[PDB]
Amino acid sequence: EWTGDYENIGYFSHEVISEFHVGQIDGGAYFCIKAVKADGSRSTPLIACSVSNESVWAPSFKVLLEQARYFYVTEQSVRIYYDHNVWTNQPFVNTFSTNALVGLSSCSAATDCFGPGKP
Amino acid sequence: EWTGDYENIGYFSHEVISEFHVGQIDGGAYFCIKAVKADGSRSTPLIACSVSNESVWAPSFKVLLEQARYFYVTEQSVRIYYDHNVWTNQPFVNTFSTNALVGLSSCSAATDCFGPGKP
Amino acid sequence: EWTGDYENIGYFSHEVISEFHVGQIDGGAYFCIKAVKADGSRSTPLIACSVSNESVWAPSFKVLLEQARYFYVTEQSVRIYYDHNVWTNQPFVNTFSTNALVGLSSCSAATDCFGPGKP
Amino acid sequence: EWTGDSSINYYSDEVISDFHVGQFNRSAYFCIKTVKKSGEGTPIIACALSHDSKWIPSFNIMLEQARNFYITGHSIRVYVQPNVWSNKSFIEALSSNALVGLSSCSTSECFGPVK
Amino acid sequence: EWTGDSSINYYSDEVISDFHVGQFNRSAYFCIKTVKKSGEGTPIIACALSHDSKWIPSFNIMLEQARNFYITGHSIRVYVQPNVWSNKSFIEALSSNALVGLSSCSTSECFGPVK
Amino acid sequence: IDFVYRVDPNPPDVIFRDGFSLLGYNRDLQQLISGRSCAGGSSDSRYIVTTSDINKTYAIARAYYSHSKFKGNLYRYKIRADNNFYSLTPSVNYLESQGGHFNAYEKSMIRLQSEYVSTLSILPENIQKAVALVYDSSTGQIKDGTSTINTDYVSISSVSNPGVIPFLPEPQANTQQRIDAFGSLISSCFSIYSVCQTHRGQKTEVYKMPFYDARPVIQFIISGN
């Protein structure tokens, strides 16, 4: 599977990682990012999580975390690629989301973002 | 186990990691954070420790450590999730705490912090 | 063994890491910090080293190293926990010290340090 | 193989303008988009995959150095190997160039092997 | 072996001016070009390979320290071992010196082993 | 560039009457970039720091509205960039050519700020409009609010100076100094008190933004550890 497979992977462009959380679930480190538009336009946050030891997106965890941390400490415009309906732990899902953070790209200028996109 | 299990995991919101310590105990690297209230209000500070090779929270030792460091570096207002009565080494407990640092999240003012919480 | 065993572990508080050295000895990566009293050229410099593959303090080598680097970047007041008579390589001892770097804590404000102390 | 091999192309005096990280198949990957520091030309895209191709051993060092050069905005020379990635959707999306080397470019010359 | 041995040369009051990373025969490698502050000439190039030579164990610590010193531009002492790399193309491209040590040089003295 | 932005707590009336004034006479560019000449340190910078990025304005508003000790309203003022507005990068390159040293920390911080400095006081004629930054506590997000159009704007259609800041002080020997930052690596020069807050004796009294050292943050993100 691929971060850029737009059929099963959604993405929100020109986001800012506003909130960062790290924790452990079922013996695995995880981090969740809450992202919003820089301006108050969308009004609903995108919550994307990444678990180090579960789901098919575990291998990218370590890099994604790092990139996420960068985008969290600078609030650089970021396109966030998420996989919906990944997490199944009901308390975890009710807390954050079912969205798995699967990709991050920089968004230089407000018109275009780097990385794979829809046709 | 999960950072967000509020029945067994406690948390203090709007804290600032004021003191950072690293060391080794019983063949394992550990770090402890002393956190006070972000407002500076009168409150006993919370000491939370993580040991790389002890307890069930070892898998999240690295990710927390880096995160804690960043939260210590920027004095960012954070919510700290701890597990009470984890460490049993009596000199260690008397020095720092029984609390195991199990999660960190960003707090965006008011009472709303990212991550799990009591309803 | 524990960083906080004040019976066998010494510490100097309110130091700032002034010099940093990294290298390899006997198949193991090592680093050695030189710390002076945070108020000018006070006292004698403490030299403490950590070897990645030698002595009982190897498991913390990475974490301490990272912390040391951060404490080297900020040039902030820190407490250094060392174990004396750990290194036995005579040229190495004549160069740096016998001291093994076993702990690092942040020292916030004029006088009060985080971490274990002597009663 | 070597970053300084004849099969390796390089582009000097570039600045990493765009950074993307994701997962392809079972490997973490990171692509960079670099433009000429003297604003001119077509952007170079090079990617590295953590568990694909012969450039696996340098993936972590390349990711760290690309992150450093992207954050500092340094003028760098990028060493790529063309025609490494074969998945077509990945190729149109980012590139087929494998990021195999990074060096610092100064105002006069850049470090690293040359052709 | 030790970076303080007699077989190890060192150059003090250096500043890492150029940084290069790449892959050489399944080994991640990084080379640094350091110059005397105020430009006294003859720049010194030192490389480290992740999976070659006896200096394998210190590759990661040396890479992080070299990155930190390049970031800060702080005056430093470089410990090299001559005649470690033998690949002729690699030798003429960068050097044969193996980067085996780095120490902070704070103007009065300079940390680390001496002669 | 044209139409840089600046975040100010004073209402559009005060700024449209007075504009922005220089804190002091410190022309040194290194002290400006590291924040020593700004509100974090000496507080006598001879520059008014603005950003061409709207996202940086949103970040500044986010930091001030999230510190929770700050009370009052914030406004983004949209300033036309005349010939007295200079990008940091050409002057930094000139200072480096003149023997100065800017470490990677300063380079990264400059790249993050998208900074443009006005060597002169920003006159009210250069300010297009003020957009109120409403901080609703429901979702904790900053919304662009009422847009007040300045009636003294001239529309000279000027552009920022692409050259080097004139009369730059001689670059001092590098000492690896602290870089003042607040919020998410926002340079301290973007803070409220980095510009002159006195207005005919009516000095605004708002929360002093605490600044952390940006070097550990930049090191933390450069090397993922």
Numbering used by the authors:
A (entry chain E), B (entry chain D), C (entry chain C): 1 to 119
D (entry chain F), E (entry chain G): 1 to 115
F (entry chain B): 6 to 230
Authors' description from the paper:
In this study, we identified and characterized a typhoid toxin-like A2B5 toxin, designated diarizonae toxin (DiaT), as a key virulence factor in Salmonella diarizonae. The DiaT genomic islet encodes two distinct B subunits, PltBd1 and PltBd2, which exhibit unique functional roles. Through genetic and functional analyses, we demonstrate that the heteropentameric assembly of PltBd1 and PltBd2 is essential for cytotoxicity, with our data suggesting PltBd1 facilitates toxin secretion and PltBd2 mediates host cell targeting. The holotoxin consists of a pentameric B subunit arrangement supporting a single PltA subunit, with the amphipathic C-terminal tail of PltA extending into the central pore formed by the B subunits.
To elucidate the structural assembly of PltBd1 and PltBd2 within the DiaT holotoxin, we introduced a C-terminal Strep-tag on CdtB in the S. diarizonae genome. DiaT was purified from cultures grown in TTIM medium using Strep-Tactin affinity purification and gel filtration, followed by cryo-EM analysis. Ultimately, we obtained only a single class of high-resolution cryo-EM map for the holotoxin, at a resolution of 2.32 Å. Despite clear visualization of CdtB in 2D classifications, its flexible linkage to PltA, mainly via a single disulfide bond, caused a weakened signal, leading to its absence in the final 3D reconstruction. To distinguish PltBd1 from PltBd2 in the cryo-EM map, we identified residues with distinct structural features between PltBd1 and PltBd2. Specifically, Ile25 and Tyr82 in PltBd1 corresponded to Phe24 and Val80 in PltBd2, respectively, providing clear markers for differentiation. Detailed analysis of electron density maps revealed a pseudo-symmetric arrangement of the pentameric B subunits, comprising a 3:2 ratio of PltBd1 to PltBd2. Three tightly packed PltBd1 subunits were connected with dimeric PltBd2 subunits to form the heteropentamer in the holotoxin structure. Pore radius measurements confirmed that the PltBd1 homopentamer exhibits the smallest pore radius with significant distortion, while the PltBd2 homopentamer displays a larger and straighter pore. These findings suggest that the specific positioning of Tyr70 in PltBd1 is responsible for the pore contraction in the heteropentamer, which enhances compatibility with the C-terminal tail of PltA. The stronger hydrophobic interactions between PltBd2 and PltA, along with additional polar interactions involving PltBd1 and PltA, establish a finely balanced assembly that facilitates the stable accommodation of PltA’s C-terminal tail by the heteropentameric B subunits.
